[PDB]
Amino acid sequence: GNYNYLYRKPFERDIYFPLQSYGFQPTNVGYQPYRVVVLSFELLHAPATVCGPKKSTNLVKNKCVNFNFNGLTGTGVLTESNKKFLPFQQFGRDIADTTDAVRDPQTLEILDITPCSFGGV
Amino acid sequence: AYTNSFTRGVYYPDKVFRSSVLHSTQDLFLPFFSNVTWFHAIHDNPVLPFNDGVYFASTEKSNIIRGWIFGTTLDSKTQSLLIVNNATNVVIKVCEFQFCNDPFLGVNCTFEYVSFKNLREFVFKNIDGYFKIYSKHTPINLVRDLPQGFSALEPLVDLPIGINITRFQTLLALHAAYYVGYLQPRTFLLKYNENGTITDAVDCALDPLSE
Ligand SMILES: *[C@@H]1O[C@H](CO)[C@@H](O[C@@H]2O[C@H](CO)[C@@H](O)[C@H](O)[C@H]2NC(C)=O)[C@H](O)[C@H]1NC(C)=O
C-alpha cells in the first residue's frame, strides 16, 4: 500500500525505531485511510481576527441595547469611558466576572457597559 | 556572578483590564527576593537549562544582547527555536539548526515569524506547545545592577510552535550585563490601581506574612 504514511504534552511533536508505516490499499472499513482536520479556537481576550460572516450594525450610545462585540453577547446602556485599556486588552471585568467595559473592534475607543435601569416594584 | 531579584518579574496574567482591585492569580512567576545568575556583556554567552520557564533581563548602554536559542539537544537532531533582533526588525525561526561552535551575530523551518542607561526585562514560558513572551523596558538610576522596587511586564508575542524546550542560550552581537531567573508555579495577589495598572504584588509563598 501507500507506505509513505507513517505513525509513532498537549500539541506534542516528535521527529526497534519509532516509525511504523500504514499499508493503505483500496481493498482494506477501519483499516482504510481517513483524513482529519482538528480546529483549535483561540477565545482569548485580545483583538478577535477570525470572525463569522455575521454583518456589523452601526453603534448606539446612552440607550439600552442588546449588544454583541466579537461574540460577547449582552444587554446594557453603552457609554464612552475614561478607562485606560493597555494596547493588548480588549475587555474589562467586574468582581462578578461579567464584562464591565469593552474596546470596539472597528474604532478602537473604550465603552462602559451599564446594565439597563431596574428595581423592585 | 549573582544578585537578588527583589520585587521583579511580575507580568499581566491575562489580557483583561481590571482596576481598583486586589486580584489573585496562580502562574509560572519569578519568586520575590529570589537569586538570579548574573553575566557580563564585557571583558559571556553560556548554555543554560530552561526548567519550567525563564525570566531574563539585561542592563544596557550599547545593545550587545540581541537574541536567544531554545530546544532540547541543540544539535540538528530536532527542531529548535531561534529569536533575533536586527536593528529595526525581529525575526523568529524553528529550523533543525546545526548551530555555531560559539554563537554570535556578525557585526525543517516548520514555523517563521517577523516584525547603565536602561533595564530590559523579559519572561519566556512554554505551555501546550505555545511559546509566550512578556516584556518591559525602562531607564534606570542605579548604575550597577537590577533596581529595587516594583514594575510589571506585558505580553508582546505568543507563538504556536509545538516544540519542546529544556535548554536555552543567548546571542551576542560581535565583530552592559544580563540576568537569568527560573519561574515557579506561584500564587500571587496583584494590586490593580485606578488607572488599570498592576502597581504592587504579594508572592504568597515568600514568607508567613505573605501567606
Ligand atoms: C522534552 O525533552 C526532554 C529531554 O530534554 C525529555 O526528557 C526525557 O524524557 C525521557 C522519557 O521520555 C527520560 O528517560 C529522560 O531521562 C528525560 N530527560 C531529562 C533531561 O529529563 C522530555 O520527555 C520531553 N518532553 C516532551 C513533552 O516532549
Ligand SMILES: *[C@@H]1O[C@H](CO)[C@@H](O)[C@H](O)[C@H]1NC(C)=O
Ligand atoms: C474600519 O471601520 C471604521 C468604521 O467603523 C473606520 O473608521 C476605519 O477606517 C476602518 N478601517 C479600515 C482599514 O478600513
Ligand SMILES: *[C@@H]1O[C@H](CO)[C@@H](O)[C@H](O)[C@H]1NC(C)=O
Ligand atoms: C543566593 O546565592 C548564594 C551563592 O551565590 C548563596 O550563598 C545564597 O544562600 C543564595 N540565597 C538564596 C536566598 O537562595
Ligand SMILES: *[C@@H]1O[C@H](CO)[C@@H](O)[C@H](O)[C@H]1NC(C)=O
Ligand atoms: C533583518 O533581517 C532580515 C532577514 O533576516 C532582513 O530582511 C531585514 O531587512 C533586516 N533588517 C535590518 C534593519 O537589518
Ligand SMILES: *[C@@H]1O[C@H](CO)[C@@H](O)[C@H](O)[C@H]1NC(C)=O
Ligand atoms: C525534515 O524532516 C524529515 C522527516 O520528516 C527528515 O527526513 C529531513 O531530513 C528533514 N530535513 C531537513 C532539511 O531538516
Ligand SMILES: *[C@@H]1O[C@H](CO)[C@@H](O)[C@H](O)[C@H]1NC(C)=O
Ligand atoms: C492616574 O492617571 C492620571 C492622569 O490620567 C494621573 O494624574 C494620576 O497620577 C495617575 N494615578 C496613578 C496612581 O497612577
